[PDB]
A and B are shown apart, each in its own frame.
Chain A
Amino acid sequence: SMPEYDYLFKLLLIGDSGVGKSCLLLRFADDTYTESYISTIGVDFKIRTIELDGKTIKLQIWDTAGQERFRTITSSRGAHGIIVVYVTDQESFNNVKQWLQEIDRYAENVNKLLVNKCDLTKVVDYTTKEFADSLGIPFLETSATNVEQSFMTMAAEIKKRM
């Protein structure tokens, strides 16, 4: 409430490499800003602005750099919403099964949404919805504008919570 946005929702994109995360944050724009050091390596987040109730809201998605190496859950506590991604992959759901639970136990007011397949070339079923409904988390198979609209809907649940 103090440049070109009123509210600001920080979002975590928890997931391993080779899982197909990147194809969710494709309709999330990279941060236009640049200087010498940021240019050489880039960043681990994407930004997005939407009009909502006549007010500019900024989304900020964190593909936390190097989550892979550390799967010990302490409280890494700030985010307004956590998103866990896993489909053309056997162990992808099995590993996520342990994370999504150890997240639910240590969180709440925070939004949760479980997720898709990129490079379309599927061993996981639309229920195996069952694990997600067990803890109370919306599940979605995605990819499209369908995935961006799935975020602009989640960016309205936090608004109702404030």
Chain B
Amino acid sequence: SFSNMVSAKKFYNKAIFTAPKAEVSVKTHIMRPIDFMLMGLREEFNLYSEDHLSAPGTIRLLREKNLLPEEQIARIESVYNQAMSKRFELHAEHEHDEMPYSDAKAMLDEVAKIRELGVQRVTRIENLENAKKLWDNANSMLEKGNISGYLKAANELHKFMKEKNLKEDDLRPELSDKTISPKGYAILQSLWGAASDYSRAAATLTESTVEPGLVSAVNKMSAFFMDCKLSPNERATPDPDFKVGKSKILVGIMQFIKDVADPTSKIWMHNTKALMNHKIAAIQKLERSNNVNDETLESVLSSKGENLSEYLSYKY
């Protein structure tokens, strides 16, 4: 949650502690890394028990909730136990915290793996910090009504997470910090409905592949932005007292499709970008008079420019 993962990665960077130059202290090279490594696993997963706060308790929780691969948990257990045994063995003789080099051979080669779980963990946290930003300006574009930018940003968000191999679940915890406006939900609500309409409307007897496909793809992206904030089936709370113009947002979706569609992309007999323009003009023309309604918009959303006389009147 708001359990600063910036600190979880502080505890992880501190554990990453590093190998010896040949000469190895059991405190500074092994037990200390692990104790920070456990506090890192504590702050990353918000590890809470109404009963932590113990090293075995923390290990017990990780197993209970499959928060980490078993092979990786057991490895932390086997090493912390061996460290425990060694500190005791050494405090019972003659340096009390330092041992010979060749004895620690097997232990350190298992600590190196835990350092690998260190970096792998830290990296994804850093990639999550970035995904926090990208989502945060998408919601910020949404906040100021600019639909052009919202769809551009939500796409940049999506592209990053695929690249850095992240999921909706991964981002949701550290988004407890921000909130989507109730009026911002009404925009998303509008965006959702217009796209849902458009996609089905554009499935016609001329063509039912490219155009609905594209429209759905826009709608999934807006849905993906939503999924990043909300849990499965968690309802959205819109402000019905504030509603965006359906014609305005339809043009928005249209602009966005122009920018992301291939130059080689074609809807039926026409180029996709070209048809978007034609459909943009037609609505802007409806907007310019006072003819924008559900019946009259549907006519545009469903057209494939099969009337070439009409389609070609816009060019000349």
B226 touches A69 (CB 8 A): yes
Contacts of A71 in B (CB 8 A): 235
Q: What are 19 A-B residue pairs whose CB atoms fall within 8 Å in the complex?
A: A2-B306, A8-B204, A31-B209, A35-B210, A35-B265, A40-B159, A43-B217, A45-B216, A47-B208, A60-B203, A60-B208, A65-B223, A69-B189, A70-B193, A70-B236, A72-B240, A76-B193, A76-B197, A77-B197
A14 → chain B closest CB, angstroms: 11
B209 touches A41 (CB 8 A): no
Contacts of B197 in A (CB 8 A): 76-78
A110 → chain B closest CB, angstroms: 13
A58 to B179 Cα, complex, angstroms: 42
Interface string of A14-47 (1 = CB under 8 A from B): 0011100000000000010101111011111101
Please list the residues of chain B having a beta carbon within 8 angstroms of any beta carbon in chain A.
Answer: 158-159, 162, 185, 188-189, 192-193, 196-197, 199-201, 203-210, 212-214, 216-217, 219-224, 226, 230, 232-236, 238, 240, 260-262, 264-265, 306
A70 touches B189 (CB 8 A): yes
B193 touches A74 (CB 8 A): yes
B216 touches A65 (CB 8 A): yes
A76 to B193 Cα, complex, angstroms: 7
B236 touches A42 (CB 8 A): no
A78 to B203 Cα, complex, angstroms: 10
Contacts of A43 in B (CB 8 A): 212-213, 216-217, 220
A44 touches B220 (CB 8 A): yes
Contacts of B214 in A (CB 8 A): 37-38
Contacts of A31 in B (CB 8 A): 209, 213
Interface centre among B199, B230, B264 (most CB of A within 10 A): B199
Verify if A54 is at the interface (C-beta below 8 Å from B): no
Assuming the A-B contacts A1-B205, A33-B209, A44-B220, are A69 and B230 also in contact, with contact meaning beta carbons closer than 8 angstroms in the complex? Answer: yes
Residue of B nearest to A18 (CB): B232
A42 to B197 Cα, complex, angstroms: 18
Contacts of B235 in A (CB 8 A): 68-71
7 more CB-based (< 8 A) A-B contacts, given A35-B261, A65-B196: A36-B260, A36-B261, A60-B208, A70-B189, A72-B238, A78-B200, A78-B201
Verify if A86 is at the interface (C-beta below 8 Å from B): no
What total of A-B pairs shows CB separation below 8 Å? Answer: 116
B183 → chain A closest CB, angstroms: 15
Interface string of A88-125 (1 = CB under 8 A from B): 00000000000000000000000000000000000000
A16 → chain B closest CB, angstroms: 5
Assuming the A-B contacts A8-B205, A8-B208, are A41 and B221 also in contact, with contact meaning beta carbons closer than 8 angstroms in the complex? Answer: yes
A66 to B240 Cα, complex, angstroms: 18
Residue of A nearest to B222 (CB): A66
A20 to B89 Cα, complex, angstroms: 57
A79 to B216 Cα, complex, angstroms: 15
Contacts of B201 in A (CB 8 A): 78
Contacts of A69 in B (CB 8 A): 185, 188-189, 192, 223, 226, 230, 234-236
Contacts of B212 in A (CB 8 A): 43, 45, 60
B261 touches A40 (CB 8 A): no
A71 to B207 Cα, complex, angstroms: 30
Contacts of A18 in B (CB 8 A): 232-233
A45 to B203 Cα, complex, angstroms: 11
Residue of B nearest to A60 (CB): B203
Contacts of A37 in B (CB 8 A): 214, 217, 260-261
A40 → chain B closest CB, angstroms: 7
A8 touches B203 (CB 8 A): yes
A43 to B214 Cα, complex, angstroms: 8
Contacts of A129 in B (CB 8 A): none
A16 to B221 Cα, complex, angstroms: 18
A65 touches B219 (CB 8 A): yes
Contacts of A33 in B (CB 8 A): 209-210, 213
B159 touches A38 (CB 8 A): no
Q: Which of B200, B207, B217 contacts A38 (CB 8 A)?
A: B217
B158 → chain A closest CB, angstroms: 7
A40 to B230 Cα, complex, angstroms: 21
A70 to B189 Cα, complex, angstroms: 7
